[PDB]
Amino acid sequence: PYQYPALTPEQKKELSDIAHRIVAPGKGILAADESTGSIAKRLQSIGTENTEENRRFYRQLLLTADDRVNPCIGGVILFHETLYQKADDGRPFPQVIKSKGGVVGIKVDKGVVPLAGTNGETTTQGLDGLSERCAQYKKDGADFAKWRCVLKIGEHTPSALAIMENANVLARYASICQQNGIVPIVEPEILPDGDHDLKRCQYVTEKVLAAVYKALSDHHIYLEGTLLKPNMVTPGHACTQKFSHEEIAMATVTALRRTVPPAVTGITFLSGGQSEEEASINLNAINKCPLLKPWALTFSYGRALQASALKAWGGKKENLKAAQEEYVKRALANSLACQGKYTPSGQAGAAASESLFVSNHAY
Amino acid sequence: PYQYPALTPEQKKELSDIAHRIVAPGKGILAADESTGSIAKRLQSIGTENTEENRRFYRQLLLTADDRVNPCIGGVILFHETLYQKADDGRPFPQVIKSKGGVVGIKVDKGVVPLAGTNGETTTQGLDGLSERCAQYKKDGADFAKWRCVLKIGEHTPSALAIMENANVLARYASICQQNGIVPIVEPEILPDGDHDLKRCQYVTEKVLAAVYKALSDHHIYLEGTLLKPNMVTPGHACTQKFSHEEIAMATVTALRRTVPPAVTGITFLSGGQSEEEASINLNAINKCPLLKPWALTFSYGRALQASALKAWGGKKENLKAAQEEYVKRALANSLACQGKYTPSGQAGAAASESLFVSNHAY
Amino acid sequence: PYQYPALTPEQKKELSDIAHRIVAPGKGILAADESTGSIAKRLQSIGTENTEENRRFYRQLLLTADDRVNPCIGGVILFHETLYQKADDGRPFPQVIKSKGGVVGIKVDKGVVPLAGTNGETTTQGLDGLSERCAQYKKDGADFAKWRCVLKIGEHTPSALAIMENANVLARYASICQQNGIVPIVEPEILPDGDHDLKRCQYVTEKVLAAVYKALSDHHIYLEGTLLKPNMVTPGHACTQKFSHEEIAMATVTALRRTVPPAVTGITFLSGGQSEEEASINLNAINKCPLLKPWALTFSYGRALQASALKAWGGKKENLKAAQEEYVKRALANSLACQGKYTPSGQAGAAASESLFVSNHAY
Amino acid sequence: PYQYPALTPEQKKELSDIAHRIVAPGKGILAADESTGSIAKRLQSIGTENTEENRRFYRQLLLTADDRVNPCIGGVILFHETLYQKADDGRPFPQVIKSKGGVVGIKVDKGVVPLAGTNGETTTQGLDGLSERCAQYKKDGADFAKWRCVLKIGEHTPSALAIMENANVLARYASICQQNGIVPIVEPEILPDGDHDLKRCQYVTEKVLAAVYKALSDHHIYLEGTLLKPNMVTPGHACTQKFSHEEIAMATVTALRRTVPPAVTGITFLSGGQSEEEASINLNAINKCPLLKPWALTFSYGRALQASALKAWGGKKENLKAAQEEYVKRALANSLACQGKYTPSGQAGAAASESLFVSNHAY
């Protein structure tokens, strides 16, 4: 083939630096990028109305937690709206995030759409005018993006077509962002739904990740200037067979070692329905795994960092402190987990948990 | 692989019928789908202002030509705007088109965007919410769509990446339309620019078309419910070597016979910068070619059906008749061409022409 | 991509001519290329010993049938051994075949080998020194070759890997033969085993053929200088649902029309276990099918042309005449079938049969 | 996709162990697998006759070097013939190799063959009955194999077709060996010929390696039970621009970090025409490179370990000692190089050399 560089050494340096800061040792990402539709089902759980102010107050609640949270959070994924909101102190949220030593990210996909002649499979859209949107977001302080593709395991679910099509769109999205100085987080999520065991998930995860990096290559994206946000290798939510945390940890790092090139700056796992505690224990075990792990293995959790905080808050402005405390707890635990230093459960074996939040999806 | 039908026998029948009527013997397509930006450079050639009324009047000029034009035009490709305009008689344009026995089409792509780490190569966007747009257009009377991808020949131009990426997006676009009862016209256009000869264009056209039908297959689209709008195989506009019309005709039908399955209802060629006359002569020779041609070989011209009409009109409402006459001339000639009955030049050999309209592109 | 011609116009002409003669109207191919292992199970059915002389006598029996057989047989596929044998009259068999207006072919693959990490799937080998072998066979009078790949339908049988791998090896084999002036018969056979219905076979056949022509394209083979030897689209041998001959005929020509380019000189079907009579009736119906069939639709049968002859012979030299008569019967019937003129059953509908010969395979 | 394991945990363990011993810290591989044709041009350089005894004596010369060589050589690649020869002491060569703590390997490909419609490109054959040959070699003491594919850089040389085809055959070869308990060394060699610079070689090497691991994945081979034998990233032999050893070292480990998964046990570089000394200095610098290198970076040299020894020997049995001394020198240097401990030149920068041996190829 032939060489026409996509990025200049200058643009390349820039992308590597951002990618590296987000995933610095002990750090992870807060994914607070629920669209108004999904946060609605959250706010609604605590009988609170889904109003812009309520959404703005809760995002603030999370984003203005005390400084114990600073060394733990490398980046925060925001929804478009929140990226233009302000804290009570009149500071735009990207400002409060940065001031606390965090990098701000923005979700840029426009949801999943059905794949015709498939068994309920899906791609995701959002490429139209993505370049323009990325240049603006860059101007407005965001340094990394998020695009989520969804795969599922069924009798004939991860259809090649889905694998090929999803891998290719992740590559297109990645290419566009890099051109605008935004570090793409590539999120090929294989859903925990179904009663498949550990090994079926590992096999499927390995086949999917292989396709994804080949696509990324074809499309010529600069790996060092990217993050990977896979699912951990776990049994299906309906599988009756039990597995320990090092069974899932071993399965996860193996799958990862066989597919993602060492040049990938880091992989930030999604929790997919796991309880806050269970999600921490698995991240820890992953980091305790004996095998050589050439990339940062950290977190990029949403509800796994938010369940207890939301529930503590319960819409009452009066519970702000108690809520923020619940979130800081989690942030600390996950900063420990992503270092294999998580003190409770989690350790080159384990098998604890207890909390729970999943739905026909996973997460 | 595994069977999950994309279309029902009912939806399949529907798509075949529409595809077949558009390309019935003696018929072709008027591509009158210039966006406001390109028609602007047209109107401007005849020192007329680019106003909605002027655009509406000129579209009307073409669309209300006398009934001699009815057996010649199977379909008309409209731009979004015109699809919602009315003729002086208060009739929506889709209505005047249909009443004259034509099927109305709508251009649905949102232009080309650069491919990073490529030599000025491009894909095209417009997939975002394409399903929704297609359902509406269907409601509003359109039965087929148009999406144009652009490839170019250079020292290293038709890069696989471009070929693969463009082929795949044509397949995605095709899949979505078929799901909404719209017959997709697949337009992989290889640009006439460069000083390449006949054979380089044939080779490249063969490689591109092969990729396109494989993609179409992977994506499971129903071929019978599609039209192909390729370029004819011609030397580059800058090639100093001369070729006869059967040299290009032979080169064109060969390239086509090696790549597009007989199940494809018909191929409607683009003129790409050829004069009205030259475009007619080549279409005719193509239809005079001795080889077995299992699909309709017809036209889907824009400026090759409009040059003389536009120039006759020259903005003066007074020249309406003289202008419409110029267009009807062309329509007749092309109805003859697509039957190998075109009486002037054009015939299993030929080499005439004379008119001219191309620019860094081709067309 | 880039142009480095594989074949010269001279080599191209040559390949087209051979391909066209084999499949001239009314003609088909006798596949008499059983290896010593399979003919052994044949000879053994009629309690005759598998000796070189017995094999040579029986091949002779077939190859020296009276002149009524001449306009019916365009080519004969021979096994390596027979290609070097002589008829009683001291004439090398390639000589008696040619003198009777037939083209001689040679099987050049070296059987199937297992595909690792697959459900009993297989490729086929024989590429090693294939070029050398082809140059010799060419010298020794053979003008076309045969290479058979085998695919099967199971809960997860036509695995992409098998499809991709088999398609690619067919392309490699095809490329080598064309370089040595031998017209490759490409044989992607999907086995009749399993209880799948008509539609599952059609879907699978369509997916396989699509892959095969894409591969062929990638590998740059000259289509016009090739023959295709697919399976007809039929239900599985274990399917309890009944289908008429036009159901299978319709299913077959549809599948074919969607996948193989009109440039392919002809498709010579394998019988795969069908009785001599049933095989004739299906070929006929196929040729009676109302749809446009741009290529020769003929036969390339083995046991479907030989069952009755072998059984008539029964090892006795005394029954030579009665045996040859049985074969000539079949040859005539199939010459009629491949013209849609087969007078008994077979006709744009039908549903007759009665004879039988299949085994864990199909054929 | 779907899970049908290729290897059992037992077979998997076995392959990992062998792979790991060959490439243990400080160890490398002696590639002494010249076919009779190439060793002939060697023996001939020192005006010695190419007789079985002369070939047997010289192989012995290398294989019976004193014990200083034992910790340095993890494996030895032998040609078929030598695998069945004996040392003067009546010991089969696989025995003397093993007794000295080495693993014996066997070259199993049958050379390169032209790719039709390509610019002098090539695949390699040797798959026919490869399984059988591998089972025998296993019985006869070999534990790893070698298969070499050759790619070249030209105006349009690394044609996709070549890349795809070569990658696929490496995967087929790898699959077969693993099934027979033999650790495949995968050798996609991009030839040093041409006047291309460092960056063109890096780009091409990155594109080739990406294709190779995707193929390997598709074919389901077990990475941990494999070795990679790439070329270092260097300018073309005809490039007039100069580069330092860390320029080539940096270029090499970057290219490697972007493409080969950390699960690959180790990469054993080929010298490709570099002098013994230059080859050592580059290996060292590679190991001195600041970047994270998750796999063993060692040597698998032929003439780069043999030049001086052969020349010292000069056919005279009398010079046995002086010759073996020259080889032991090199072995030691390379054991140091592959540890970044090579004491002369070589160090996170350098730019020395001086010796020379390349020909229209590279090596």
Any idea which residue has 């080309």 for tokens?
B112
State the CB neighbour count (10 A cutoff) for residue B289: 21
Task: Please tell me which of the candidates C4, C127, C131 has its beta carbon nearest to residue D119.
Answer: C4
A261 shares contact with chain D (CB less than 8 Å): yes
Cα of C167 to nearest chain D Cα, Å: 12
Distance, in Å, from the CA atom of A150 to the CA atom of A162, rounded to the nearest integer, reads 9
Q: Is the dihedral of CA C276, C277, C279, C284 positive or negative?
A: positive
How far apart are alpha carbons C126 and C146 in whole angstroms?
A: 11
Mutate to test the interface with B, among C217, C220, C297 (most CBs of B within 10 A): C217
Provide the pairing of β-strand C144-151 with C103-107. Answer: parallel
- Sequence-distant (≥ 6) Cβ neighbours of residue A255 within 8 angstroms: A202, A205, A206, A209, A233
E strand or H helix that includes residue C336: helix C320-337
Q: Is A205 exposed, middle or buried (0-12, 13-18, 19+ CB in 10 A)?
A: buried
Please report, to the nearest 10 degrees, the dihedral formed by the alpha carbons of residues C76, C270, C261, C193 taken in order: -150
* Angle ∠(B12,B15,B18) on CA atoms, nearest 5: 150
Q: Give yes or no for B292 touching C (CB within 8 A).
A: yes
DSSP code for C92: B
Residue C89 CB neighbours (<10 A): 9
How many structural domains are present in chain B?
1
Dihedral angle sign, alpha carbons of residues C125, C127, C128, C134: positive
Q: Pick the catalytic residue from C121, C165, C187, C189.
A: C187
Q: What does DSSP assign to residue A115?
A: P
Burial of A112 (0-12, 13-18, 19+ CB in 10 A): middle
Q: Which residue has the tokens 């995605």?
A: B172
Do D350 and D92 contact (CB within 8 A), yes or no?
no
Q: Which of D350, D324, D323 is nearest to D244 (CA)?
A: D350
**Residues contacting B40, CB < 8 A, separation 6+:** B50
Rounded to the nearest 10 degrees, the angle between the axes of helix B303-313 and helix B320-337 is: 160
Say which residues have a Cβ less than 8 Å from residue B144's Cβ, sequence separation at least 6. Answer: B18, B19, B22, B75, B77, B103, B105, B106, B182, B183, B184, B185, B227
Strand partners, A184: A145
Residues in chain D: 363
Q: Residue D325 pairs with which residues in a beta bridge?
A: none
From the list A331, B348, D114, the residue with the least C-alpha distance to C178 is D114
Instruction: Report whether C3 contacts B255 (CB < 8 A).
Output: no
For C255-274, give the DSSP string.
HHHTTS-TTS-EEEE--TT-
The neighbours of chain C, by the rule of 3 or more Cβ pairs under 8 Å, are B, D
**Distance between CA atoms of residues C314 and A318, nearest Å:** 100
Inter-chain residue contact C1 with B259, CB threshold 8 Å: no
What is the residue whose two structure tokens read 């896979």?
A230
Q: Which two tokens stand for residue D262?
A: 């950390």
- The span from the CA of A115 to the CA of A159, in Å, is 10
Using an 8 Å Cβ cutoff, are B289 and B250 in contact? yes
CB A337 within 8 A of CB A271: no
* Nearest chain B alpha carbon to C162: B1
Q: Does the annotation count D278 as an active-site position? A: no
- The partner residue sitting opposite A262, judged by closest CB among D204, D223, D292, is D292
- Binding-site residues of D for beta-D-fructose 1,6-bisphosphate sit at 42, 271-273, 300, 303
Distance CA C32, CA C226 (A): 20
User: Range of C312's domain?
Assistant: 1-363
For A153, what's the count of Cα atoms within 13 Å in the CB-facing half-sphere? Answer: 32
3-state DSSP helix/strand/coil % of chain D, to nearest 5: 45, 15, 40
What phi and psi, each to the nearest 5 degrees, are found at residue D251?
Answer: -60, -40
Distance CA C289, CA C256 (A): 12
Beta bridge partners of C183: C144
Q: Who's near B252: CB < 8 A, 6+ residues apart?
A: B202, B232, B233, B282, B286, B289
How is residue A33 written in tokens? 């990028």
CA distance C131 to D115: 12
- Distance from C-alpha of B258 to C-alpha of C224, rounded to nearest angstrom: 8
Residue C285 corresponds to which amino acid? A
CB C276 within 8 A of CB C354: no
| Chains within contact range of chain D (3+ C-beta pairs < 8 Å) | A, C
- The CA distance from C296 to D287, in Å, is 63
**Which amino acid, D10?**
E
Do β-strands A183-190 and A144-151 pair in parallel, antiparallel, or remain unpaired?
Answer: parallel
Closest by CA to A3, choosing from C154, D196, B174, is D196
Q: Is residue C25 within 8 Å of C294, Cβ to Cβ? A: no
User: Which residues lie across from A73 on neighbouring strands?
Assistant: A28
Give chain C's length: 363
- The answer on whether A300 is annotated among ligand-binding residues is yes
CA atoms within 13 A on the CB side of A250: 11
Q: What is the DSSP annotation of B46-102?
A: TT----HHHHHHHHHHHHT--GGGGGGEEEEEE-TTGGG-B-TTS-BHHHHHHHTT-
Experimental method: X-ray
* Minimum distance, in Å, between the CA of residue B261 and any CA atom of chain C: 5
How many CB atoms sit inside 10 A of residue C222's CB? 24
What are C293's two structure tokens? 């069939």
Chain A residues within an 8 Å CB radius of D203: 1-3
Whole-number Å distance between alpha carbons of B75 and B181: 16
Return the residue of B nearest to A176 by Cα: B116
Residue of C7, C121, C219 to mutate, testing the D interface (most D Cβ within 10 Å of its Cβ): C219
The number of CA neighbours under 13 Å toward the Cβ of A155 is 6
Q: Rounded to whole angstroms, what are the CA distances from C51 to A141, B47, C43, C56, C315?
A: 85, 92, 9, 8, 12
CA dihedral in degrees (C277, C283, C289, C292; nearest 10)? -170
Helix (H, G, I), strand (E, B) or coil at D14: helix
Q: Cα Rg for chain B, rounded, in angstroms? A: 19
**Are the Cβ atoms of C262 and B292 closer than 8 angstroms?**
yes
Active site residue D229: yes
Q: Rounded to 10 degrees, what is the CA torsion of B237, B241, B247, B252?
A: -30
Bridge partners for B146 per DSSP: B107, B185
CATH number at residue C181: 3.20.20.70
Q: Inter-chain contact B1–C160, Cβ cutoff 8 Å?
A: yes
Rg (CA), chain C: 19
From residue D314, give the alpha-carbon distance in Å to each of A357, B296, D64: 77, 75, 17
Closest residue, chain B, to A126 (C-alpha): B128
CA angle at residue B304 from B298 to B308, to 5 degrees? 135
Residues 6+ apart with CB under 8 A from C148: C107, C109, C124, C187, C189, C229
Q: Which amino acid is at B154?
A: G
User: For residues C207 and B185, what is the distance between their CA atoms, to the nearest angstrom?
Assistant: 23
Q: Which two tokens stand for residue D112?
A: 């390169």
Nearest Cα residue to D208 out of D225, D229, D182? D229
In angstroms, the separation between the Cα of residue D136 and the nearest Cα of chain A is 30
Q: Which long-range contacts does A242-246 make (Cβ < 8 Å, 24+ apart)?
A: A242/A351, A243/A197, A243/A198, A243/A351, A244/A349, A244/A350, A244/A351, A245/A281, A245/A282, A245/A285, A245/A345, A245/A346, A245/A349, A245/A350, A245/A351, A245/A352, A246/A285, A246/A288, A246/A289, A246/A348, A246/A349, A246/A350
Residues contacting B103, CB < 8 A, separation 6+: B18, B21, B22, B74, B75, B76, B97, B143, B144
Dist. CA D147–CA D127, nearest whole Å: 10
